[PDB]
């Protein structure tokens, strides 16, 4: 609920960060998040693709007589069939589009939290989904930001100070 | 599809090599690719893979400091640079390509085709 854009330009993933330090500005694509999302999206379509409908005689279906109460029954029988299997395609369509849309907005949160844990009192939030260090980070201290070796005691005392 | 590799050669311990892939039969702006090494005799390793444009590159540990990966998707090469190379280097490199088709070009999950692959080898 933080993030109100999408980063057009993100080209090599589907989540990622891009930061503005003394060095200059970069960006970084995630990989960790990306393929466990596409993944639960991958696994969902297999689900629902499966082949398991085999039917090789079936009743007739268009007449070209009029009779009476056997013609109408198989109407009857093949209409509340197709109703039926409608309104089924319907639900599913609709309960899978919204599994997709929390599970995706769930792995930016996902990412947002162990990012915010990393900065142990050495970052604040800034309303948006950006972080405010408090200390002077070169290239090879983002990385380790995304790589999840950031030590944050070695930056801690000069981080604590600045924020206060 | 057809990948085609080069540059393989003989170099001397700490020496340098640029190994080069050309591809051609499918866009090579969409699908990821990787580069795997295989000892003479022994298993399959996984080395480097890259992004479709380019921007994201991925090494195993035991090169990440060394080789390099990069390519030229203008050419439709992709190449791979070997800057300090030690005696457990001496294998067989393959080229290889995403083979899958769904949001192709951040990783390579899985190498449909592969090069016939080319022999690099390091020795006194």
């Known amino acids: 609920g933080f993030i109100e854009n999408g980063w057009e330009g993100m080209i090599d993933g589907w989540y990622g960060f891009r930061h503005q330090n003394s060095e200059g500005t970069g960006q970084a694509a995630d990989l960790k998040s990306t393929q466990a999302a596409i993944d639960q999206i991958n696994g969902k379509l297999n689900r629902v693709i499966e082949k398991t409908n085999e039917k090789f005689h079936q009743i007739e279906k268009e007449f070209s007589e009029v009779e009476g109460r056997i013609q109408d029954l198989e109407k009857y029988v093949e209409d509340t069939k197709i109703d039926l299997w409608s309104y089924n395609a319907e639900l599913l369509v609709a309960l899978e589009n919204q599994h997709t849309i929390d599970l995706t907005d769930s792995e930016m949160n996902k990412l947002f939290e162990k990012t915010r844990r990393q900065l142990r009192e050495n970052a604040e939030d800034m309303g948006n989904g950006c972080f405010k260090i408090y200390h002077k980070c070169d290239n090879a201290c983002i990385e380790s930001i995304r790589n999840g070796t950031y030590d944050h005691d070695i930056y801690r005392d000069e981080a604590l100070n600045n924020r206060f | 599809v057809q990948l085609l590799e080069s540059g393989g050669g003989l170099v001397q311990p700490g020496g340098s090599l640029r190994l080069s892939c050309a591809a051609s039969?499918?866009?090579?702006?969409?699908?990821?690719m990787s580069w795997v090494r295989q000892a003479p005799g022994k298993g399959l390793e996984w080395v480097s893979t890259?992004?479709?444009?380019?921007?994201?590159?991925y090494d195993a540990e035991s090169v990440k400091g060394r080789f390099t990966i990069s390519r030229d998707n203008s050419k439709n090469t992709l190449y791979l640079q070997m800057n300090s190379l030690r005696a457990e280097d001496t294998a067989v490199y393959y080229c290889?390509?995403?083979?899958?088709?769904?949001?192709?070009?951040?990783?390579?999950?899985?190498?449909?085709?592969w090069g016939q692959g080319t022999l690099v080898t390091v020795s006194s």
């Open positions: 890259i992004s479709g444009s380019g921007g994201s590159t």
């Open positions: 039969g499918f866009t090579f702006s969409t699908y990821a």
């Open positions: 290889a390509k995403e083979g899958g088709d769904f949001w192709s070009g951040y990783y390579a999950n899985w190498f449909d085709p």
